[model samples]
Target: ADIGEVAGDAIVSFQDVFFTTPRGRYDIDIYKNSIRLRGKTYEYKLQHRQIQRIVSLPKADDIHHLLVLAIEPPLRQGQTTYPFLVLQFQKDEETEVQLNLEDEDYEENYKDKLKKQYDAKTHIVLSHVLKGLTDRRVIVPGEYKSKYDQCAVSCSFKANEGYLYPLDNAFFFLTKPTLYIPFSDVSMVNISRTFDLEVVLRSNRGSTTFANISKEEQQLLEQFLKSKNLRVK
Candidate 1:
């Protein structure tokens, strides 16, 4: 049924992992409005299940510890045909749990599935375990580092700019257009010679290319997609 018990505590006690990682490093703007006269912003922040988009804010006085979400269903906000990102968006990871499981319990309930105690890369590891329960994911480059060489590359979606995070494979854009593109559904990632990533999904009709992607980070993104068994161009 589950991983076993450890340290005289039930291994299932690690459910704490889910709640333990409720923090992040970005802002989440779930903004939606209508008409030039209507300045009121509305949000449809779904309950993790109806994840339309995940866009976290920046490392402000404040985050980068923020989370933002994205949207569709076309509505005009100001000059844009639809809502524009950058105003903000919502987005929305990890650590390991458990250690001392008596040898017998380890044999019966645990089978090297979940580890005893995790080491590093808290977000990815936590996300990994949650995938067992949640079906969500995280990235590499180790932890949430903010250097230019991000585990995630910076890209602009729509017209606004946001950081693109590594998913189990796809990407979770920070907002503007809180976008998530799965490699499983991708066809090609064509570059324009040290240019922005022009992701071509499995669609001949059109491609929803993002804006402001880090030019030189192609190698970073490449090494990232490297493990995905994806076709890069």
Candidate 2:
């Protein structure tokens, strides 16, 4: 039984996972050493070893929890670099899963260990399994809060619905093309009457425009920027 089908060899599979850009739903099948994302028209064999960082983001609307599996040597074709796989998980749905591994075998590889059986809310199970398998913890929500007690600002990054999240030393935007902008790289912030937050970064990294944020959040934006010692015009 050598070289089995990708789905057949999976230890865990999560169906109906969504990706925003190429715009296809996928079935994510996790194996002992790799993950296979089977979509409507595409398939990716993502090695667990290729994972660089796992950044977690909460959808501001409270519907989904997102995982941007940033990998080294990002998957690309033509001009655009598909740096990460955007996994959208329903926040509250409960899930139960079983692994195909024998207890002793998996215990040898998974440092924290995984039970033959696992159950939890959907996001918990998925993220936990990922950490258990890859040995990388999820990097998540920042410390800043808004006037409305929001941890992340709802905005559109590049016309895709995402959140402009504040971290200790950087800002993160997660949607299709997920990225984090380090604080030291920022050169200017343009605060204008148009209501768009344009951040100009230093050097080869150009700029990012966060649009569609409401007027009320503007005041909140200025406060956080100034507190963080970032200048605003």
How many residue pairs clash (N, CA or C atoms closer than 3 angstroms) in each of the candidate models, in the order given? 37, 0
RMSD of each: 12.7, 3.6
Alpha-carbon shift of residue 116 in model 1 (angstroms): 24
- Residues 82-119, candidate 1, lDDT per residue (tens digit)? 32222311112333455456667666765444555665
Residue-wise C-alpha lDDT for candidate 2, range 1-233, written one tens digit per residue:
12225576678888877776335687889888888777665667778878877777676777877777777777764566777777777787878878877667777865465667888887778878888777787887766777687768877778687778877667888765677787888887777622778888877477788887778788877887878887777
Best by TM-score: 2
RMSD of 2: 3.6
Q: Against the unseen true structure, what C-alpha lDDT does each candidate score? A: 0.44, 0.75
lDDT of 1 at 154: 60
lDDT of 1 at 9: 29
Best by lDDT: 2
What are the TM-scores, per candidate, against the unseen true structure?
0.44, 0.82
